[model samples]
Target: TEKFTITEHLVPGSHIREYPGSTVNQEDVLKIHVKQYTPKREGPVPDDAITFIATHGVGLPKELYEPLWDELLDQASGFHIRAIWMADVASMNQSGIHNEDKLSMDCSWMDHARDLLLMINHFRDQMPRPLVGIGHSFGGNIITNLAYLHPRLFTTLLLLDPLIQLSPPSLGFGTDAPSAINYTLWRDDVWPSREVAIRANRAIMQGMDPRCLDRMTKHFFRDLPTPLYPDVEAIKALFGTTADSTTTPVTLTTPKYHELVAQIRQNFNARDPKTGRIEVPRDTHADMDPLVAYIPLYRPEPRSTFRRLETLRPSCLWVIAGATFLNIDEIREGVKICGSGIGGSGGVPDGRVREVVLPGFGHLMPFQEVKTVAETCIVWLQQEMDRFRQTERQWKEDRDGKSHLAVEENWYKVLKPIPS
Candidate 1:
């Protein structure tokens, strides 16, 4: 081999979340975006090579999970990763979407997730194998719906701190006024330099891993201008604005017509590396107020999939962040999901679910130690893929012989006296 390499591509796609195929007009659909990473090497590849899809929570870019991918690539030395698909919720990143009836639809979690579903449906036959989905926080919650909609879409899922909240029927919605809602509360968003920002963040963020910090800083600051830099030419084509243009790039190119534009939920920025501390960032959005990422709205079909547990088919694995970051309620509902698959109450008769708890890691496990989390996911996928094949072999078993009355009767019990 001259040298092993990887190629990445940003692909365009679309989906109508509310009704998958009900609409025909272009305006009825939203843009779907995905970043594809494919390894380039000289060797014959198997037909069943694995593919992956990883996503992050709201108010953040998929870039937050970059290190985890690097670790997976490093850990799985010779493993053939046919492709890796990391998606961004539309209107949240470089991707943008337009919806006229804004208030009724502001891009819910399921809205973004169907994008993954559409992308899969488009490439299903072309890909080598079923997708291996890995997501963090709300991303995990979103992937759950993707699985619910298409059970075999993924060979299995690897979720980290998944926000699998219960439905309103199970647990009605409510909100708390966090420090964020208090206007008096503020955090300085300005930074004198890049170096100062990293230092301050390391202190403020507390337990983030050194490696993860490196990736975080890449997006956390305003990049200083350089010679023939910032992709000036390419910026003009798609953005319809110029670097030295009279209009501001942030204002002009941004899709102002759309009501629900994503704001700087991170709110902090650093300009230079040499200069000292600057200011801070806070509750930041232009058209609307910043909604807390953790809170799901109180609604119907647009609610949690805990109720859909019995119908979910993908082999699933949950890598929990430990006791504290999770709500006791999610765990309480999680039991139903876990039990749904294995002959437990209100679960799928043959659910394929397993999980790992990194006791003290908490909700930030992926960022605390990317390697541990990535390895855990890789191992889970490998094991589940093997198990999927194992179950497929029992294909002869055809339909489920669930513990119904007839099936239960076979377990055998001597007849006892009963009044008729």
Candidate 2:
């Protein structure tokens, strides 16, 4: 059986520590760190007491939330907030290096998700509170899937710019791009020497700042859309040195960097072949086909049976702000170029999906305008919680009074699931 571990990154004197829980006894102790914030006790618990299960985007460890954890803790007033990060499997796998077969099989996502759900169940059983899910990028996808997969486990969700569909056309692959680079440098034969690979790995570790690694790992993308995005400098610094360079001195250049840039450009410039117009693909430029094939075998189509959106409880509120430091229009256009005619949508939409077009903010909304995002999320959650409570209350009252027959339905009906 798989095990879940907890590590707290917000310990006062230290960067990380263990989560003290009785249930942890006799379990395989996977190293983990958790961030503890001043528990919110605003006079008394509000009508709604919420817990936040915050998962980082895929590829990122929980540490990404270190900077924003405190702020979110304060903003989530009246709610007992504990920011849970998925560290057990991710930390153990260490970017899929330890388990090459699993990584190649693309089972890491499912493993991580399962570990998170088990931990969530354990946490929920141990503590009595209404749980809400919060995630960004890949984290968003994970939570989204979990909520649907296990609706009773969580009450609400907050998805921060999730990368959902990985449609081919949206990824900007065309006849022109070099035949997908199918090689995985991490594999045994690809590396010149284990020493070279180890050195490269160390260099990546040394150069990447916490924040950027979080974003890249979560989004599974090499570069952020804008400079204001997290860990811009460190990302630039790391990529500048290691991106094109061979892991070990080799006879030929892999052309990895050039291919990556071309892929981005192709995806960003994806246009309609027949109409000459463009449509945004349901995926991001980071979803390069070669990279996808190299890492894992999972391939998603717009309407694949495996493409089950209903699996991801679609209750999360996705907030898309208009004001971003990067060219929002350009980014959208790039998405359109790469995403031609697959999803029929670019960026976040309005109505059920809230879109806040702030006038002067850039892509780094969570980092630069942390307060704004937090406030908006809180307000939305409150309103939704109230509405849910009222509906639930009414159902109970009607059932007790014999005014209306009680209907028994699975929570999955309420939380629509989606495939990543």
Candidate 3:
């Protein structure tokens, strides 16, 4: 078992959201925040060591994965993971604080994927060989899209209860999406004190692992000056005098509206094909953009269907909880398709994509079953490493044989000196 050291970073991202002719403000450039975990007892990371780049679910922080990473690093011995980088979505956690007023309803899942791309590109030097990508929920979708956009970036992808389906209605809790949206919108975000917020969060996340719960408790809340949207003149007139605001109330780092926008903007048809502007206008309630709510929480295309499964470049491990609300039928179908060799085998002569279901676990398995998820990942990753080594050895042997033949073929020609 090994202890790990962690460091944080903020990588500058593209200003794609503010292209010319867009209604969004030009200043809303995205910057990705990431936490890098490296084993404390290292001279330098080994060449063959795996580098895991992971993304968190929508509205969740990268910090949520700390406990899971801790277990993974501590347990695995044969398979060496050089570093684990957990990324925060631009609109959530520390990244959200950085982009506080810049957030709008314009960012899509694709945009989030782009942000990842930017971060990866920026830190190419630090990214070790045999890169493995891990993602949960909407983060899974983002990682999948990233793999599609740059096929060579990852050797393997580990999707944790990924939301990949042909239709939303097929999900067991399809109604849960809308209800979740409503809950996020109306949730009590502000607390009079940090202790009160901690107690409230404990009640909400009762089943989560204490370690994971502790991280969220420590990092998710921030003390901010209230009457958050200040109208200084109006406040002065109404109160008959104005003193510098004294009260500092605790609130979630990510605003509720930002979370709601992420939930509602899952529909693929919301933006114009040509202009990339939102097709429909914001509604009377202003709670959400009408176009974004065209479909519920999942899109129809880019689904993990048999056809799409064939197109995948990297081997995939579809990790899910036994009690997950995601459409397991579709997920199982993908597993079968990956093993069937209907399309490409993702560089493996035999299909390597498969699924692992953790029993008695819920959709948020990482938080609740941290040790189990980490153990499962370790086992699968070791198997993948074995496969990778075998493939690489065979490729090298083949190349060397080819080179030897080429040299033999040229030897005769070299001996005949002055033919020209």
Candidate 4:
């Protein structure tokens, strides 16, 4: 028998400008793809069990994390995860396929953040206590933003090499930056077949674990009904395919152009001329120059991406790589901002925030060492559960004999508001 069973879900997202004048019923709406992983061997989900809600990085699909999920489910000893839900960004993977026609470069990371909040609120009833939000890279930043907006949504957070900073560097902001536009747009996307793709992708994905690479090969490519490149003869010569195969082809699930847009669109922080409010452009795709349309103004005077981690309520585990594009020193400062007493509670590094660096690993450490990452996560989850029990007891004692359910309902009702 299988150890776990997975169910698929398609969550609706907020309206956005997909076309010149798009309507809610038309190409303006977004569809987000999510999957629920449930343990099958359990008699019933334990009341004390925790729920793990996860999001993947840009370009990669949610399914690429299957190896890590499998390892965590099989090896955890101290804590129980009743359910694991993996959500995909609308412009990536299965969701990308769902939103192919309506895809636009105007989409920003803020939109992705809103989509995550929508998913959480939509599935609020099914989510159990002690919610743990796990995210990687761009997804990690999205989770950080969402957590700050609605701190009660998650009990704890596990960030894997998040690209967020209190003061982000301006080097990678504009189109002039290396790898901002040229590399991603020109990268290979189509292949005649899966076997050819695996062989061709080996050099690029060499750092990935074999199992993780296998998962990517399985889930990252799809058969498109129409040919993206119209020249069949050129494609045949390029891919060494048969002459008969001129109709359809297998391409990356997330289009290369979309991937390029996702990388650059994160810096889309423009201000309105009249209102003096930050806003993204109406037609980002129309302007090929992101620098002209959306100026990268991260050189903020006391500005931040995920602000006020020091005042944050939820416990966090920040997992980073020893070797990566990110500035480790800046991340160290970011970590210090967490759980550093604000109101004379003693400015000491408590168990609320922790950091762990995987030696000699790059930004994609999860893919290179899936088992190690899972084991590290399990260790932290166990410790968080231990701390949670003590805190829950004290919190209940302060409530003067009120039940946990009633207290939770009252808290949610009183504090609930539309996220900004």
Candidate 5:
């Protein structure tokens, strides 16, 4: 059922392993509300079916991320996906009930990270086959934390434009939260008409990649329901209400009737018909979270948050945008860390890293270049699988020796009738 059932505590045997310095328990876990998206298939499922858990960045919904994810699915020529659970990362979108279960505005990225980890394991235990994780922007940070927090559940991570402040925030590290907060929090969410809303966005937000911009813009055009006012969405969210939004906030807009869209705007290199740039409600960028914005640089221990994808023990795929926020070489360094003679118990060789880069599509590259992102994943996943097979072959040859594997040592097959 596409529904959310919430309570204070959890069932027994939650299997929730504790995190470092974490006093939070499963009983205090947040219920990540889900809306299922069952992709249409060609009838039968594949033998190597896999499950995917996709999480969105701070302000976006699971729906907005769907366009890029749908692109990933299109690249699934070699393997098959059983289903994908595109869920909210606690208070992000439709799942806006605060973790403390109050009307307070307080939020923390760690809490959201913990909540997401709990949900992944909670949902994962009931599913079949290996699970794959795809995250974009802030969601990238969430999945990365979950990988270390609960490593066993994941088989791979598809990190797209991940905001991985893997160290203490530099002077200009994170987004300027104070000023940018207003654009995302206090902006207009409820619209007079869905028709006017789309027109406004299209005319202004044309900088967004035309390919998936419409899909994301469609999410903002949600009735009464829009993007710039997530605090509003969180409130009316409980009752599933709507509003007739103008620029004004306090307008008899009843508590039972309101909308709140969290932070973010889309700006590309394109020129709109009206303005040269910064079209009305749409701008170059805005999606950022202050609460969990700066993840203290991951400790990078075998089990720290700053970890290589291979540390998760499966072939992880990274489809990065050529954005400048994340140093391109960091991806390469991540590979070096996971390669043979690198970090592990015996310095044992681990999984491989496969990747691609798209230029001019920095933080939001996945959505901006949907077709290319899909092809990269399609290409990367296939290459990674072949690498896994090759590694397995090499390991077997080393352990069993080439002679035993080939069984061509003795020419006489049954000289002594030795069960040849």
Candidate 6:
């Protein structure tokens, strides 16, 4: 519950601010970074303006979507955008693992989110304008919870391929999944360098030899599908340009590759009878466990729970779901079967809440399809603003009419106006 203050870690740069965690006094606080992007002006300030607060997916920092961020800023001719890095929870703990203790800290992901919302509210208090919250993966869950908890803070919400569900029981993994065994192996031994992680990932996807799913690989690609084919370009883009031309060539021998595959088979086959299974049926509480139970690589708790946002004032709820990445059909089915229980329901009549599904986009919509996402957000925010204004006008008109009727009633009581 304690607030971690970083007095000396502030570093300013063009459109980007960085805070070093090592410099902070709090033992459980991670580094924080916030990036601001103001729209370019061709002539004059546009009459209507909006501000966007974007959050990244789980495990990834803000830098992961720099390309998408750049593209969005360039196209946002009339709005200001900001991307805040949700610090890695693991960085805050002594064990450097994602755990419950890390989740308890205000400097953790949830607290950082509240702080960001407060900052936006402060900015809006000074200069009122439309504001939106955009998030992806685990970040999407955060945005949804935040918007619902404090709807007044944002005019619109955009969630891309959020990790709404922890994981199906069939995966033979629990809520506390271990971090990539390979990553831990590499990190502990200091072998193969950071670049090794990428190589290992690629090798696994390619079905090449020497591909192992140690704690590292399990941690990295947990709950995600294994691509049938390697997406070399996506991998390269994910890691940045340096990955394309590393000095050391990543080579996996046939024997080593087979050996790694064998290891994975062995590990995956050995499951705890009570907790592990291939197909977890519905109504099973196993899926409800914390996501961290499946992976042990990270010390901090996975940001996947829906907690009340106590810091901000609630006003409106905007739920944005992507078309791709997630199985829309599955979500729709979930809505029909569960109906606002697990997966979100589009027809919830909460009056102040609304859900919108993007026509054609994947979980990476905010980054992969920035323009469409931005346009959708702009239109949605504008519509909500109009709706609010109309509601206010209707209330005022009704009140005025009631007041006039009261005046007439008073006149009748005192002395009826003759033929008025």
RMSD of each: 12.7, 14.5, 7.0, 7.3, 13.3, 13.8
The sequence of per-residue lDDT tens digits that candidate 1 reaches over residues 1-420 is 012243434444454434222223434545545666666647866555678877775444566666677777677732457777777666544444222122222334666567787777667765756568787777887887777776666777777877665432122225643321122114333333455556654532567777656656664443322211244345345545454444321111112211121111122242223664332222222212222222222222223465566566666777777644456456545745653653222333344576677777867677777888878877766666676566666863764665435555534576655777
Query: How many angstroms is residue 25 displaced in model 3 relative to the true structure, after the best TM-score fit?
Result: 2.3
Name model 2 segments beyond 4 Å from true. Answer: 1-47, 77-107, 127-129, 169-307, 310-314, 321-364, 399-420
**Model 2: per-residue lDDT, tens digit, 27-120?**
3233233433334344654544565677654234444454455555566543445334434233322322222222111222333455566565
lDDT-based ranking? 4, 3, 1, 5, 2, 6
TM-score of each: 0.63, 0.49, 0.78, 0.79, 0.59, 0.47
Q: Give Cα-based local distance difference scores for all models.
A: 0.54, 0.42, 0.69, 0.70, 0.49, 0.40
lDDT of 6: 0.40
Misplaced by over 4 Å in model 5 are 1-29, 97-103, 110-117, 120-126, 167-214, 221-304, 307-312, 327-335, 338-351, 387-420
1 versus 2: better TM-score goes to: 1
Worst 10 residues of 2 by lDDT: 10-19
Q: Model 1: runs farther than 4 Å from truth?
A: 1-29, 77-80, 96-105, 167-205, 221-303, 339-351, 391-420
Give candidate 6 misplaced runs (Cα > 4 Å): 1-31, 42-48, 66-109, 121-127, 166-171, 174-362, 375-379, 388-420
Candidate 5, residue 32: lDDT: 60
Model 3: residue 388 alpha-carbon error in angstroms: 1.0
User: What total of clashing residue pairs does each candidate reach?
Assistant: 15, 35, 0, 0, 16, 46
- Model 3, 1-420: lDDT tens per residue? 136788889887666652221114765566778888988863766667988889887677788888888898888856787888887787778887776666655446666677777887787888857889998987787787777777768878888988766444332244444356567768887665567677866644769888878777777777654224234445344434445355334777777777766654444445566986655533321233353344434433235332466567778888988887677787777666653433345433465777888878887889998888888788778888888888888988877756543466667866886757
Give the C-alpha lDDT of model 3: 0.69
Candidate 3: misplaced stretches above 4 Å? 18-23, 169-178, 202-204, 226-247, 266-307, 338-343, 346-351, 401-420
Q: Give a tens-digit lDDT track for model 4, residues 260-321.
A: 65555333446677996656564533322333334553322112444555656678888998
Query: Of models 5 and 6, which has the larger TM-score?
Result: 5
